[PDB]
Design a protein around this ligand. Structure first.
Ligand code: HEC
Ligand code: HEC
Ligand code: HEC
Ligand code: HEC
Ligand code: HEC
Ligand code: HEC
Ligand code: HEC
Ligand code: HEC
Ligand code: HEC
Ligand code: HEC
Ligand code: HEC
Ligand code: HEC
Ligand code: HEC
Ligand code: HEC
Ligand SMILES: [C-]#N
Ligand SMILES: [C-]#N
Ligand SMILES: [Ca+2]
Ligand SMILES: [Ca+2]
Ligand SMILES: [Ca+2]
Ligand SMILES: [Ca+2]
Ligand SMILES: [Ca+2]
Ligand code: NA
Ligand code: NA
Ligand code: NA
Ligand code: NA
Ligand code: NA
Ligand code: NA
Lengths: 518, 259, 518
């Protein structure tokens, strides 16, 4: 059985913790629930850690007092199809292989599934670790609670004796790097300096051997990513988000300075040896838009190249961990701002961006966002009980499973079927424009080999490559973004029509140039 | 927000509680969750209570950390038909009125329904308080969570100015007495001596005015009836049961001495 | 009403039948249930047949004493979509037409449906008989019991006055030949010599006019294909299977000599005029793996060409009726062993294999096969009754319709939804790799015309053709195989990654060669 410790003894040194813990709703929660610090207390000084205390990062540390929220979080949505490749005719991007050629996502890019699986899915996807990590067997794919208990309870490593990234299976890639893990787990929260910069107190950084880092990590989406364990108050912990909002002064709502002030973020820094080490962002309100934006954003978490001279930008560079914090129509400028692109297209040679799941930046300026609606209202609503204590559902999933709470309490004029119909109108329309955008991208791409072999000039090919950047950006935003336009239907429409326009321009350019060589 | 108290100071005078609390699974649960003892600590000695500390009896004192158990408890089973009289041809005892004639249950004996309603149902049944207590209106019969929050949030008293048992409706009885309440609530656990014997320290006893007692009671089936709040371990609190099992030496399983 | 005959009179001549009938569970079943032999008994000698007895091949011969098994067999699974073409974006092989160009399957290749329809579906598919045979009208497609009663109760022939294979509809082929019928019916079991070799006692053989043969055949999947009618014991009758297992000594489990001995096959030969004529394979156990492998295998049942010199291999050659009895990684060697390929690709010119439904060979070595599980456990389980005599379901179909019996009695740790989720994880992953394999095959194929027209050398084109063989094999196995990887997920993964690797090699080869000509 747990035996409480004297928190006043800790507070003698830990004044920041005192200030947070004594005031919030965890003022009665003893440190022993999450820390084993006996040897630490025997050896520490006011400025030197001494023996390092044990800190629990497992989600079951919160589940004995918050079982309802834990059990809701760990539920597996079986209707969220697992390991479903997006580059197929029945998924999100039928022509993805042709369009993404040259990028690691060509090796595998599946649709997302329930949050319990995020860390194991990261470890086992074919693009990440060369096939090094696999489920122990094909039964384990069902085991959401097991994944939550720990990744290494359900996975194997093909070679525990080596730590290099290499291919164990032929059609895999080794794109994983330490930055990725920040959106899968925060088990490393005490072992990683802010931004992954080199730091004498950090075991891990942007330049670490990612296979070694992986082996030290266990739990997905820790409860403390959104809730400070000491104050119980709302927060974020993701460095790239704090960097955008606070360090670069862009605010929580870059398009709305008033909402940014009302729903702001305060950066709190913790030190090692009286040097800044790590940071958190305390929120003014329990604002899920910003909580979810720790991960559901467009980012850099990877090496790339400079737009200016084509030189390599490695993991050592700050730009390898970057939140652009820009909507689709501001993105090209944001990428120019840091002089960065992701890959050269394998067929066209164009410098291209790689977009990823920009839900937060897409939601900005939408009708729902402008009306004060937030991610949680549609994706983790309050539970409705005939008789009971209300709590917030932590099963983050499509509103289709809980339409009464997610939509119909606000939209009293609609039945469930009417609300579903409105979602599908947008998704069907948007998907049609995604498909047409891909058709035109593909038509352009297929002209590049013909143009090159016919002797079309480098100047014309470069003009077409410049068009390819924009045609790509204004399409791929929407295959990356998970709502198929629902989050901002007018923006999707405008973007996708722009993509098509750019590809059509490039097709005309290249056809005319080819025809002139004949 | 709750601010913790120095439990070690309490333990200087409460060794009995110390020995339970420090060993069980509530060793880390601070006393402020269930007690307001500030004025008590200012005035007590080890031999003089001083000001009486307040003890929470509401079930929400436990629901903060044990929401799943609380929400499962308070659920209303709508399929358990409510206010269904047993002396009818389609229930348990078609000839009950003839057979029970002379007993108070002839006035009303319904089938049981969900636990959330036990205290309110005891208060409102036609055989208990002469019809003195009623739901505020006929809508309130659905409200299990409200009954749990407290009986007097959903009921009315026909005459707050009197405390005698009497008939307010013609075909009622006044069979309720203080012993009944021990199987409806334990809000009175610190105000009732063992067995309801007379005692200098007990506000309430077997011989109390049941209408006065009723007004001091709020919550059904308290969580601590089965779980010691200090050790978190399994227990019973009902005096009659302890008296049979232990005092009279009958054991927990009178037909099986080994068990 | 049936009147029994004196079986002892038959047994005077038919000692093999006596030995089987008197010992098994049909010892009390009189011959009149299946044979009308009165004139035969009047005219036969110990060595000459005399007048031929009538033998019932209809399944209703078994249905008066085994109605439960018959009615379960003839059930139509309406959820098994009928006449659904695989070369469509929503089915198994979105790029099949490009990849299979030059082969008859380009004319039509539908997904399988319920067993009742196998013979009629064979007769009416657009690739088989030039459109000669059709359902009497479009209502008849529903009539499973009617098809079982006889094909010619529900079909018409466009020209009863001719027996040649020809096109009656423009976009049909005439690929059917007599070997095909052995996996649709055994109505011809007394009229077909072992392997379809020429034989004086056989009405039909590999070289027969298939339209004439077709007209003599009526019933699908006869009950006696798995059960000897005389002993009632487990058996196979399919010649190609017996040839692989017994004649070529490969065993019932080629990868496991111990299991092969425990679960073996004994070849029993019947003669005409004291010359070997036909054969059956009695099984040691009621082993559905081997029963189902009469048909659910990769085979030759068709003419082809030799790998060595390109010469034609006709129906007259034994190789036209062949069970390779080899897993995907042993297949190329098995095809080299008989010096055979199926077709030349219409665009690339490569010699290619044609694969068909290799469920048995894929199942070998899988986790389930290694644990002693067999096809029937998942596809025709025992019925579970609260009160009743248990029998074996004969409705061979997906386990999704009977998950409690097919999966959950063994997998007590799972709910139905969890088990379904595990199936879909494998199928989704495998299908993604099938689609990627097709993308890379298509990319290679499309380079052949460009390379040929640019003047790339025959030596380079032949190197690419050799790669095409392997890229094709390691893809097509899996579009042919019906489990979308479930039967052997690790093997599918390895094969499909090999396909992609081979195509990528060919693409690089051809692009570099084209670029060198410019
Ligand atoms: C003064 C002698 C200290 C006492 C008393 C306690 N801690 Fe401490 N701790 C101390 C230092 C100098 C540091 C390094 C950071 C800093 O503020 O300079 C720490 C660090 C921790 C940590 C972080 C550990 C890690 O892995 O990074 C934890 C979780 C921690 N301390 C907890 C803790 C507890 C619970 C205490 C009471 C039992 C306690 N500390 C006392 C110095 C001192
Ligand atoms: C029991 C010993 C607890 C442990 C372990 C954890 N929490 Fe907690 N939490 C506890 C209490 C008694 C309360 C107050 C309840 C009330 O409403 O009065 C809380 C509160 C929270 C909250 C709400 C905070 C707010 O609204 O300001 C959150 C978000 C929360 N707790 C989160 C949480 C996390 C993430 C935990 C694991 C790190 C955790 N709690 C543990 C009691 C206990
Ligand atoms: C936060 C800014 C992220 C970083 C850094 C990385 N990932 Fe991610 N990932 C993130 C989200 C919000 C999602 C769900 C939404 C979606 O569009 O999928 C994902 C999903 C994945 C998946 C599952 C789906 C798939 O693509 O197969 C995998 C396998 C995955 N992520 C891997 C991965 C890798 C290898 C990363 C570093 C190169 C990486 N992620 C970083 C958020 C974020
Ligand atoms: C960010 C993605 C979150 C993670 C990770 C966790 N929770 Fe959460 N929690 C989140 C939100 C948006 C809210 C609602 C805030 C609002 O006021 O609208 C909550 C709330 C809670 C609470 C408070 C009581 C309630 O409303 O249910 C608790 C006790 C709580 N959360 C606990 C908790 C646990 C145990 C988690 C890990 C399993 C967890 N949260 C993760 C957002 C996020
Ligand atoms: C709720 C979770 C509680 C916590 C935490 C503490 N106490 Fe308690 N206490 C609680 C109840 C419901 C009662 C009523 C009696 C019962 O057995 O249920 C009590 C009673 C006491 C008493 C009176 C004992 C007696 O002589 O009759 C004392 C002296 C007391 N409690 C002290 C105490 C201390 C010092 C605590 C912190 C260490 C403490 N309690 C916590 C409920 C809860
Ligand atoms: C949070 C501040 C709590 C309050 C208020 C209450 N309980 Fe509790 N309880 C709490 C914890 C951290 C634990 C240990 C969890 C673990 O498994 O480690 C418990 C445990 C219990 C138990 C189980 C005891 C056992 O198995 O020995 C019970 C029966 C229990 N708690 C009951 C209970 C009651 C009735 C409460 C109101 C009087 C109550 N708890 C409050 C945390 C908290
Ligand atoms: C514990 C030994 C009890 C005592 C003392 C009293 N009651 Fe009770 N009551 C008890 C239980 C276990 C049940 C449910 C099972 C059942 O057979 O009903 C009840 C039920 C009631 C009801 C509801 C049903 C009904 O009869 O209408 C009422 C109105 C009720 N009890 C009233 C009541 C009165 C007036 C009591 C003292 C005279 C009394 N109860 C004592 C357990 C116990
Ligand atoms: C609006 C046109 C109503 C319709 C339709 C129904 N009810 Fe009603 N009900 C309505 C009002 C304005 C009130 C009084 C509210 C108050 O607190 O003053 C009620 C009351 C009831 C009651 C309580 C009756 C009592 O005597 O205490 C019940 C049990 C009730 N209503 C149930 C009910 C049912 C089941 C209905 C559909 C058959 C129904 N009501 C319709 C307003 C309206
Ligand atoms: C000896 C005079 C015979 C008697 C008595 C019966 N049969 Fe016969 N049968 C005989 C021969 C020589 C042959 C040819 C095969 C052989 O063993 O050499 C047969 C063949 C059959 C067949 C196969 C017919 C076909 O179409 O190929 C059947 C089904 C058959 N015989 C059945 C049968 C029955 C049921 C008899 C008792 C009524 C019977 N035969 C007697 C020789 C002799
Ligand atoms: C009635 C006159 C029968 C006819 C016609 C057919 N079968 Fe039969 N069969 C019959 C009996 C009395 C039995 C024995 C039942 C028992 O369990 O004792 C059987 C048995 C079978 C079996 C099981 C054999 C075994 O387990 O060893 C099979 C597979 C079987 N029968 C198949 C079958 C076939 C395919 C038939 C048509 C060719 C057929 N039977 C006809 C009775 C009768
Ligand atoms: C046994 C080794 C077989 C031979 C010889 C032939 N077929 Fe077949 N066929 C067989 C199986 C096990 C299946 C079901 C599984 C599947 O993948 O479809 C089939 C299916 C068909 C179908 C229906 C599906 C379709 O392709 O449209 C048809 C029309 C069909 N078979 C025709 C056919 C022809 C023309 C054959 C000789 C050239 C032939 N089959 C041989 C097993 C076997
Ligand atoms: C009576 C008013 C009818 C309605 C309503 C439907 N059908 Fe019909 N159908 C009808 C007749 C008289 C016939 C021809 C019968 C014959 O054998 O001469 C049919 C035929 C069909 C067919 C076959 C078409 C073919 O070209 O062979 C089909 C597939 C069919 N019917 C299906 C069908 C459906 C699905 C209906 C509801 C949408 C439907 N029919 C209505 C008469 C009538
Ligand atoms: C191979 C593809 C089969 C065909 C064709 C038929 N049956 Fe079958 N049968 C098959 C198996 C795998 C089994 C189970 C064997 C085991 O021991 O696990 C059976 C069993 C029977 C039985 C025995 C009683 C029972 O278990 O139900 C009978 C009587 C039977 N089969 C009859 C039968 C009929 C009438 C068929 C044509 C409609 C038929 N079988 C075809 C495999 C195969
Ligand atoms: C008992 C007769 C079984 C039947 C029926 C089904 N399965 Fe099975 N399965 C069984 C065993 C003994 C094992 C291996 C267990 C171990 O850990 O050693 C399995 C394995 C699986 C797997 C994993 C496959 C892999 O290659 O890792 C899966 C996905 C699986 N089983 C699913 C499954 C399904 C969906 C079933 C119904 C169609 C099914 N199994 C039946 C035993 C038995
Ligand atoms: C992840 N991207
Ligand atoms: C069939 N093939
Ligand atoms: Ca999903
Ligand atoms: Ca990006
Ligand atoms: Ca009841
Ligand atoms: Ca099918
Ligand atoms: Ca073949
Ligand atoms: Na989905
Ligand atoms: Na491995
Ligand atoms: Na009932
Ligand atoms: Na199907
Ligand atoms: Na016709
Ligand atoms: Na093309």
């Amino acid at each position: 059985n747990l035996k409480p410790v004297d928190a006043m003894q800790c507070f003698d040194c830990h004044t920041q913790i005192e200030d947070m813990h004594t005031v919030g709703k965890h003022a009665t929660v003893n440190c022993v629930h999450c820390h084993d610090a006996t040897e630490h207390v025997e050896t520490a000084s006011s400025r030197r850690m001494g023996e390092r205390p044990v800190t629990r990062m497992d989600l079951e540390a919160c589940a004995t007092c918050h079982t309802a929220q834990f059990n809701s979080f760990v539920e597996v949505r079986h209707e969220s199809h697992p390991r479903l490749e997006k580059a197929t005719p029945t998924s999100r991007s039928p022509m993805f292989d042709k369009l993404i050629a040259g990028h690691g996502f060509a090796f595998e890019h599946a649709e997302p599934r329930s949050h319990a699986f995020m860390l194991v899915d990261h470890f086992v996807v074919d693009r990440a670790y060369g096939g090094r990590f696999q489920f122990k067997n094909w039964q384990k794919v069902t085991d959401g609670m097991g994944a939550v208990r720990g990744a290494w309870t359900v996975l194997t490593d093909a070679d525990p004796e080596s730590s290099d990234q290499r291919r164990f299976l032929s059609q895999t890639a080794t794109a994983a790097n330490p930055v990725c893990l920040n959106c899968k787990t925060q088990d490393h929260i005490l072992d990683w300096a802010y931004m992954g910069d080199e730091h004498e107190a950090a075991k891990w950084s942007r330049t670490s051997e990612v296979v070694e880092f992986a082996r030290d990590l266990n739990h997905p989406l820790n409860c403390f990513m959104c809730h400070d364990p000491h104050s119980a108050g709302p927060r974020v912990v993701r460095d790239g988000l704090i960097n955008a909002v606070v360090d670069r002064g862009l605010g929580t709502y870059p398009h709305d300075p008033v909402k940014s002030e009302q729903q702001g973020m305060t950066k709190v820094t913790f030190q090692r040896g009286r040097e800044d080490f790590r940071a958190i962002g305390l929120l003014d309100t329990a604002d899920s838009n910003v909580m979810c934006a720790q991960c559901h954003v467009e980012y850099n978490c990877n090496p790339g190249y400079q737009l200016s001279d084509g030189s390599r930008v490695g993991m050592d560079d700050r730009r390898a961990n970057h939140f652009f914090w820009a909507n689709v129509f501001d993105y090209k400028e944001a990428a120019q701002e840091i002089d960065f692109f992701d890959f050269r297209h394998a067929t066209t040679g164009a410098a291209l961006p790689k977009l990823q799941h920009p839900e937060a930046e897409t939601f900005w300026g939408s009708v729902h966002e402008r009306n004060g609606v937030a991610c949680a209202d549609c994706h983790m609503p309050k539970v409705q009980l005939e008789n009971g204590k209300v709590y917030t559902s932590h099963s983050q999933r499509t509103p289709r499973d809980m339409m009464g709470q997610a939509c119909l309490n606000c939209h009293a004029e609609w039945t469930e079927d009417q609300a579903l119909y409105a979602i599908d109108y947008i998704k069907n329309y948007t998907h049609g424009k995604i498909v047409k955008s891909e058709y035109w991208l593909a038509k352009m791409i297929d002209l590049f080999p013909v143009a090159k072999r016919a002797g079309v000039s480098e100047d014309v090919l470069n003009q077409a490559r410049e068009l390819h950047y924009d045609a790509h950006l204004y399409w791929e935003w929407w295959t990356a973004e998970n709502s198929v336009g629902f989050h901002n239907p007018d923006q999707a429409r405008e973007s996708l029509m722009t993509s098509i326009s750019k590809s059509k321009e490039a097709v005309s350019l290249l056809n005319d140039a080819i025809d002139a060589q004949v």
